[PDB]
Amino acid sequence: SGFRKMAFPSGKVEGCMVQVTCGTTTLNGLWLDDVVYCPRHVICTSEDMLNPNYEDLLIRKSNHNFLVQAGNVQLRVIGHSMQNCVLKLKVDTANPKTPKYKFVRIQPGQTFSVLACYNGSPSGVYQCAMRPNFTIKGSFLNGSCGSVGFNIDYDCVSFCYMHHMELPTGVHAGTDLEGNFYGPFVDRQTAQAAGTDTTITVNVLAWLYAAVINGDRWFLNRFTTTLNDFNLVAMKYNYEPLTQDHVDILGPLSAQTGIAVLDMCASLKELLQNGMNGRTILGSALLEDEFTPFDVVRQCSGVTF
Amino acid sequence: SGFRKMAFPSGKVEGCMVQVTCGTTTLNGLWLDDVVYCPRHVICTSEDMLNPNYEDLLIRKSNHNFLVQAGNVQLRVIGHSMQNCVLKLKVDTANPKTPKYKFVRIQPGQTFSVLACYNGSPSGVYQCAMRPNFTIKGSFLNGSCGSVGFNIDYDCVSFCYMHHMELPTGVHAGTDLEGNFYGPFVDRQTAQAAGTDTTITVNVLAWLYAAVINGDRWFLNRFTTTLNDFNLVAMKYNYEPLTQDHVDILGPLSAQTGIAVLDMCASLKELLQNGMNGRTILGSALLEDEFTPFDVVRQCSGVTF
Ligand SMILES: *[C@](O)(C(N)=O)[C@H](C[C@@H]1CCNC1=O)NC(=O)[C@@H]1[C@@H]2[C@H](CN1C(=O)[C@@H](NC(=O)NC(C)(C)C)C(C)(C)C)C2(C)C
Ligand SMILES: *[C@](O)(C(N)=O)[C@H](C[C@@H]1CCNC1=O)NC(=O)[C@@H]1[C@@H]2[C@H](CN1C(=O)[C@@H](NC(=O)NC(C)(C)C)C(C)(C)C)C2(C)C
Structure with a gap:
């Protein structure tokens, strides 16, 4: 598919995006209810950013100094505070499109x-x-x-x-x-x-399950491995250690395909040691680690929002 | 960046997506103004789909037979017609979220x-x-x-x-x-x-301009080529012919980077004949053709909507 x-x-x-302007700096803000969240360096000039004192620069700022705009419509700022590296600008109007x-x-x-x-x-x-x-x-x-x-x-x-x-x-x-x-x-x-x-190992394994589901099965060998032996091989290739918690998270894909996680681990161990010989998996020539086990199931078994 | x-x-x-149900078949629909557009095979049973007579099956369907739903809210169907492989279901309510x-x-x-x-x-x-x-x-x-x-x-x-x-x-x-x-x-x-x-040649060239913009410049050689000579090489590698219209479309990227299209063509000619030697371009190990010259500029020079 x-x-x-x-x-x-x-x-x-x-429906939450706003434009936040302070002095000559404009950046994006997130408007949820009657509060706008934006990076605190919106109160900085290009020179302050080299070594800034945010607590000091914020003292010299009053509410009216923040030009907040939701499209054409300007929102009136009635309060401001700093929570870590973020600014919370309270506005006189609650966002009706807030999810x-x-x-x-x-x-x-x-x-x-x-x-x-x-x-x-x-x-x-x-x-x-x-x-x-x-x-x-x-x-x-x-x-x-x-x-x-x-x-x-x-x-x-x-x-x-x-x-x-x-x-x-x-x-x-x-x-x-x-x-x-x-x-x-x-x-x-x-x-x-x-x-x-490092390479997110559990995500590469989930991507290998996505490939089997889709018909790309060439890389599947007839071996199994232990969690310990696999982690010894993966360590060399800058892959994060696979924990038993990662094994359990991969359960649904394992049960759906009929391939035990440790058998898929043996196939991955072979792809790290032998390479891909110019072949692709899911149209990709490199192993992919930006798909979690959840992204795999949600996609290959249509979760809507 | x-x-x-x-x-x-x-x-x-x-804000335009609706659910269209006819008999036991449910699929998605696009609701723009007071009309819903959906594939015409929504009026088919699994057996009809093997060799269907859409014009015939639509005769045996009246307005009330189409259950159209925008979230929880059912839209009343007041008319139906067929335009090629698509169904236009007129509804009693115009979509207020129509862009x-x-x-x-x-x-x-x-x-x-x-x-x-x-x-x-x-x-x-x-x-x-x-x-x-x-x-x-x-x-x-x-x-x-x-x-x-x-x-x-x-x-x-x-x-x-x-x-x-x-x-x-x-x-x-x-x-x-x-x-x-x-x-x-x-x-x-x-x-x-x-x-x-075939491989969309003008899109691969645009992707090579995106790579230079981003700092990946290793593949750039010190040669130029003619439009004719390049097309002779590309033909062998299943690449579509590059026309003078493609050369002009690539103008903005060429002017922005200072690399003439025919010099970038010489660099691509070398990547087809010599390969990438296990190297990547923009993190990719394969040449990418799914980015038009416009996608490149819009992304590398922030076009908003
Ligand atoms: C942001 O302020 C904005 N308005 O978009 C901007 C976003 C940057 C600019 C280029 N691409 C982006 O993602 N962020 C900044 O300008 C922040 C800001 C000031 C410096 N800064 C940087 O991102 C710089 N990077 C940097 O200093 N990197 C180190 C050396 C710390 C790892 C730079 C060089 C402008 C990209 C502060 C307060 C960190
Ligand atoms: C669609 O009707 C729906 N409700 O989602 C469905 C979408 C398909 C199903 C699997 N992934 C998809 O994208 N489309 C169909 O069921 C259409 C429909 C009937 C057959 N059909 C197919 O896509 C089939 N393919 C097919 O016949 N391919 C050929 C041989 C023509 C190249 C199949 C095998 C069910 C995927 C019709 C009217 C074409």
Whole structure:
């Protein structure tokens, strides 16, 4: 039936996007009820960003200094506060298009959709994974700050990410909706190093189950392995260790295909040691780790929202 | 800044999705103003689909036989007609969430976003390209029929595709919003062969410009070539011929990067003859042809809708 990197329908999130302007800085904001959430560096000038004192710059700002716009319509700011690296601008009007929502902090290895926005207007939507080094491989230009990452559960929008900065080699970093950065990053234009990234093993295994479901079965060998032996091989190839919790999460795909997780582990062990010999799996020449076991089932067994 | 397969924000299209039921068949419909558009095989039973007479089966159907639902809310059907392979069900209520729209027939090689739906509910959004053989590499299960492909131009939704069937190796076929199939396909469960696919050359060249913009420049050689010589090489590798119209369409990227189209053609000619030696371009190990020159500029120079 086909397998694509599918993003969540962005509608519920689009109705929340606002444009936040302070002084000469404009970025995106998330308007849920009577509160607007945006990165705190909206109160910075290009020079402050080199080493800023956010608490100090916010003292010198009053409510009227924040120009918040939902399309053409300006929202009056009646309060402002700082929660970590995020600004909460209270507005005189509650967002009527606010969906049922939660603020979650995703774990590394989990996926989400990013609705990239410029001037409070959505330009596109794509699926991302929180890398083990706490970064994301996104597509963001100047003005994309404030764009959010999310997941949908029938009617509930679970917001997990807000864009803040770009790192070397097109890697991106940001915070949860409580202003807490994911990883060892700070909102300052100073040298900051991202840790070594690893391949999300449980996601590669889920992608191998998606391939069998879809008819691509060539890589399947006639062997099994132990959780210990597999982890010895994977360690060399910069793959994160597979835990028994990862084995249980993979249960549904294993039961659906009839392939025990440890037999799929033996097939993956062979693809790491022998290579793919110029062959593809689900049209891909590289092993993919940006599809969780849930993304696989939701896609290959039509979960709607 | 990063480069991802980005889809258009699905919001404007989500507000148009309905569930269409006739007898025991349920699929998706597009509700624009007081009309619902859906595949005509909604009036078929599993046995009719083997060799159906749509004109005959539609005679035996009256308005009340179509159960149309927008969420919980049932829409009363006050008229029905057939335009090619599509059904137009007139309803007593105009869709208040209808956006400014057009119905276009895209040319092969062009891209669009697919909002995959089940029971009139959106499950996800992804970017597709109309293959030169008039098929799409989508992700559709049973119940996905009626899901639509589209493009957005600031506020205008240009609907170009409606899902009808699946072809061998996870390839998909459908119609424009006037019920005309793309390619030599008919809505019947009989053996039908899809032509040989080719690689969209102008899209690969646009993707090579996206890579230079993003800093991946290793594949750039110190040579130029003629339009004729390049097309001789490309022909062997199953690449469509590059026309002078394709050269002019690539102008903006060429002017932005300072790389003449024929110099980029020489670099591509070398990648076809010598291979990539295990290297990647924009994180990809294979040459990508599902990004038009417009997708490149819109992404690398933030066009919002
Ligand atoms: C954001 O402020 C906006 N308005 O879009 C912007 C988004 C960036 C710009 C290019 N692509 C993006 O994703 N973010 C910033 O300008 C933040 C901001 C100031 C510096 N900054 C950066 O992202 C810089 N990166 C950086 O310093 N990276 C280190 C060295 C820390 C790993 C830079 C060089 C402008 C991309 C602060 C407060 C961090
Ligand atoms: C659609 O009717 C729905 N309700 O979703 C369904 C969508 C299919 C089912 C699996 N994945 C999809 O995208 N489409 C159909 O069932 C259409 C319909 C009947 C047969 N059909 C097919 O897609 C079949 N394919 C087929 O016959 N392919 C040929 C041999 C013509 C190239 C099949 C085998 C059910 C997938 C009609 C009227 C064409």
